[model samples]
Target: RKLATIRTAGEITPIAGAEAIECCHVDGWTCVIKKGEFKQGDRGVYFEIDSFIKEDNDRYPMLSKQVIDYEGQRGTRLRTARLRGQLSQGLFLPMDRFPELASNQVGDDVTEILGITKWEPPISTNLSGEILGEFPTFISKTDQEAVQNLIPQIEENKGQKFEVTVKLDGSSMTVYRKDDHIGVCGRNWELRETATNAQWHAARRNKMIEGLQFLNRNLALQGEIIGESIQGNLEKLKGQDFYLFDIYDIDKAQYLTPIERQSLVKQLNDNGFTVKHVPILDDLELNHTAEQILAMADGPSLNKNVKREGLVFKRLDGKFSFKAISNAYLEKHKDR
Candidate 1:
């Protein structure tokens, strides 16, 4: 959803011996491109991270290496990558890439014209069970806007208090209790309460139904389900377990604040439920620079020895949040 027109390509910084190319700074991101790729105030198309760009001709050979065959079409996908030690996030393409938008001015969305699609992870067989229907409208899905898409606002929000939590690498699961009925769901689909369904298995394993017994009302809990059978058991977790991240009041149709969410997790645990909560890294200050925030993502994961997936910063006010993923993690998990 992060598409914007080029307002300005900040100062051009020379990149060593690349005479034909230079680094163009735009807001918080930098794009290395051929000299004269665009003027200081040229109008162009900017695609945010996780966008799958339809493969064009060989004119963009430098970017062609990032092309992938996704959902049956070959195309380039944008992600955070390093170029000569400098970090670059998102992709900037000339307006000519979308001929239909030639008449459009700045700040227009060219995603559809350029055949862009959001990148979604393919669900593993064991994780995706029998689909009952669309996701339930009573609960919000677990999704976050990448930090790369929010560079411009980073500086403006400095010094604000935020709750930073580890971004787990696993499948999303949701369990809810409505009156006397209990249900489970995957990220995008509701699942029948069958023995083989992953959500059902996770819900029972975590004693979710019993945990919600105390509430005696409509409530939904969303979290990540990780273990050996999921995501190749990247974390080498002992067994499949749910780590709660969100709690919603289904009747009120609202999510709990950070403190309330933590309280809910504690209440579940106090009731002898095995539900684990994602580790809270810190109550951080937004005064850190973008580079510093990214650097913080480079570290061991709480559940594994490998580089952490990333960090999620949730504002205390619950007004805004974003994810800063680790470049090191991406380099290791290139297949994703």
Candidate 2:
């Protein structure tokens, strides 16, 4: 096959993968994505969409084995087979699942099975290189989070500094502004030539009219679109609100500092757009502080008032490293 090229069709938008995201018609449905929302027919891929991609790193090894073993053994001899793809082959096995594998393994434990030996590899390519940042993210896909105990943590610090922000619950999105073009993505997958998310359009509309007006020729901004989409008509979830929380400029090689990010928030506000701050605090113990935020994160579960999930944490100095305590900021019905 020819080298994978951008699918040219439908409405095209600048997302966070490759050069640009092109939308198109795929048989029965139109494909599109922005801010991590993807709709392919009725079945879609979303950031807060499911538990599969968002599980804790430790849990994934155990949680995903049943699906994988079923594919590797019964489904295909092809080296590039994927679990979902093999599952469609009609060769399914359930017993090989490995949810408890982690519990069974000790630091140096080893075993042989089916004439093969267990060994660890140096590394694995997680996904296509075009996509950057973490997925199945502990935080919302838009790259925003605040250190809760951050203020105190800052005071306790011997060196370094931090920033604080008022967090907002919303959809996460990324826009890649390159010298040649731009592409937008949802929380999980690249959307070019794929699925379309209306909220992303709204964010763009808002961005065009207000927030982070510096859409330089080559740059990217990863942030959240909170508001009615949280619990409004466009919302698949609930408890809607609106806010823009992060800013990235690729060409300038600058991710707005916490204070500068606040300036971006004000920019949005001045333009009649509401914005939220994902606090950035320095010198904070993430695990313990995460617990406190998780405790306070309790409230109406947004839509039907489900169990309150938790909060997300990110380094405030435009580090892009993030952490989370609950699904309230991530996909519900899953463990972080």
Candidate 3:
């Protein structure tokens, strides 16, 4: 899904002094390009933010110098980079650049064929304990679809009601209780509890599983684990803590909606569980355009001083959800 086709190349804006270079305005964002690389109505492949352009690929040699060693891989991952004060969200290549993808339609995903992979952060040894197995299929991963790729969906639900929350920066964590068995996991896999495992440390230090045992009901909780040792403590947080954002009913195999999530969070707190909820920013009428949503995303963090990561929009009915990450935050944490 990181790869797509250009619906429009937008108007060409010339770059001063760099005669061959220009910028094309796209839906709510811009794309830096060589002049005449594409026309206004041309259809071609586009690499969205967080996509890695392979270094060994002959198709894009220009990216060789820009290649980054991310998570042990050498590649140039597309991201939101400010060029000449204009924010660019992705990369565009003419259809001829990817001959094999020429026949693919505008919305088709061509990631696999083009050797593009989603950029994943490196997991530290302390955070990646012995893998017990893959993440369970019963629960959803914390990852949400980025808003930049959902223009049509946004327009379709223009007038809907949605809840917005500050998108926290940290590692994904999940704790579950089922039939008296408790499990802890990072984003992609279940972990074997060990003294060195960061996730296990958080669960053990907080007595998370033990705290929820009183419920006597099968359930799972998902959240971000953040602190001084994680994500650069962007919020200047004191110690590591899990900030809960999702509650799952193990028996029903469904996630609680935002309204339901609020009540469950309160109940967890009332029951003596040391749980911190993700900060809620505001409720919004979906009538705002994508640009406006992004504008609203920028602000000081709950702790103030540091910039907020951005905002997550979840409809009241849970029918639609996406994230609008702050360009400022991306710029600040570019190395990470």
Candidate 4:
């Protein structure tokens, strides 16, 4: 659980109709905490949503009711929830709950010491390609920290224009062309190029390596694989398809800026590659509260009938980005 860390509670606010509980802020995340149990500026262990906390210690008797065996480990799986009409994500426990750790400093990671790991949704057979090896080192993994974890960054980055893209509901897929060799990858593995593998199927159908050869360099095409068995096929297509979200220059160790990316896309299209990227909504000023911005993640996705997972905001500098997942979406998919 990389999401578990020592944090200083920022604000403690009461809910409209709740008496027994109040919400506290750790960075950008709002978590329901017991009323009068903590004060502002207190340090504690904050577990982000999807953090499966194993009950190896007796620190939390209250969580026993929430415990269940997740993938063979008995633990409490924390996630986003609504309480008294208030949005609450993750869990926060005070220092006394973990008295063994001598470090009381803020922003320290205690995930391993506290026995926590990330909880992931079960993979369906079609998307679970045979693992050939670890994800390649030349290309970075796909991920974005949720906006609920970056309050100060948002505050500091106010007035900057960010590219807003609809967050896709699917599995992460990558196709890389390096030294005349083409490779396909799922989120965490280098998959064998078997005929049945959806990632490879999409790669072949879309001619994934054509643009890479035209560019004449070692690079990665990172995107989401929608349709078929992925995330209930929220995009609603005939078969599996890949949509580009990023083009990483493997040797450069940096992502392409927005202008460069657009030009590359145009170049590919002109040359008949027909490569596609995620829908770019607009470039807007980052001037909303974290809560307000998170609310914007709601509403419809590309397939209007389906609720969107969320939205992603990327600062034009290509140096900062974060995701804002719809709380409603979380509630709908709570079982995940």
Best by TM-score: 4
Q: Count the backbone clashes (under 3 Å) in each candidate.
A: 0, 31, 0, 0
Could you tell me every candidate's TM-score relative to the true structure? Answer: 0.89, 0.41, 0.90, 0.94
Worst 10 residues of 3 by lDDT: 1-10
RMSD of each: 2.6, 19.0, 2.5, 1.8
lDDT tens readout by residue for model 3, 48-141: 8778877866677757667888767678987777766567778877887777765677667777777778786655556786999988887777
Q: Give lDDT: candidate 3, residue 232.
A: 74
Q: Model 2, 157-251: lDDT tens per residue?
A: 32333342334444566655455444555567544422234434544555532233353434345665554424222224342323445666564
Model 4 per-residue lDDT tens digits across residues 292-319: 8998998788777888899998888777
Model 1 residue 22 CA deviation (Å) reads 1.3
Best by lDDT: 4
Candidate 2 regions exceeding 4 Å error are 1-171, 179-182, 188-196, 207-219, 225-242, 252-254, 272-308, 327-336
Higher-lDDT candidate of 2 and 4: 4
- The worst-scoring run of ten residues by lDDT in candidate 1 lies at 1-10
Model 2: lDDT of residue 199: 35
Q: After superposition, how far is residue 313 of candidate 2 from its true place, in Å?
A: 2.9
Q: Comparing candidate 1 with candidate 3, which one achieves the higher TM-score?
A: 3
lDDT of each: 0.75, 0.37, 0.78, 0.82
